[PDB]
Amino acid sequence: GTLNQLFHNLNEIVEDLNKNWHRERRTLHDFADELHQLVKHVHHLQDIVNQLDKLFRDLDNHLQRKDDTVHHRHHQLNKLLAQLDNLVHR
Amino acid sequence: GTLNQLFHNLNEIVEDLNKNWHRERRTLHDFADELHQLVKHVHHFMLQDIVNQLDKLFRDLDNHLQRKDDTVHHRHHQLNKLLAQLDNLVH
DSSP: OHHHHHHHHHHHHHHHHHHHHHHHHHHHHHHHHHHHHHHHHHHOOHHHHHHHHHHHHHHHHHHHHHHHHHHHHHHHHHHHHHHHHHHHTO | OHHHHHHHHHHHHHHHHHHHHHHHHHHHHHHHHHHHHHHHHHHHHOOOHHHHHHHHHHHHHHHHHHHHHHHHHHHHHHHHHHHHHHHHHHO
């Protein structure tokens, strides 16, 4: 029974982790895209336009790097769940 | 046993989650500081559509980071309890 309760709980937490990243990724991409707009609205003030670019690039870097980190943790978490699943239904 | 390796593996995953939450928090807070930097300078210099847009972005970012701290707190606590239960069951 306990093992099943661990599987169930962890299963929810894993799902919650992946849904929150789906959400955050969207939120930060829109954020990125609005910086990107702003760069064009400016260019259409030399310190400023350059700062917007940098920020756009920082955030892009972060999203790419987090995406890779999330991919890797999700895979490890799914393998763990599989093992748990097998153990409870054994 | 294989529950002991389950525990070991989940421990490292949660440790890496915690470590990446701290780094993520620092990166985006530094980003917010830089964005704030930009807003006030643009607002000094000042057509005005650009100010409103930047100021909106800053408030959206700040909102996000507050919510993120809350969600992380809850998630961290969920994972600690589960690990404890796992740890106990391994003994």
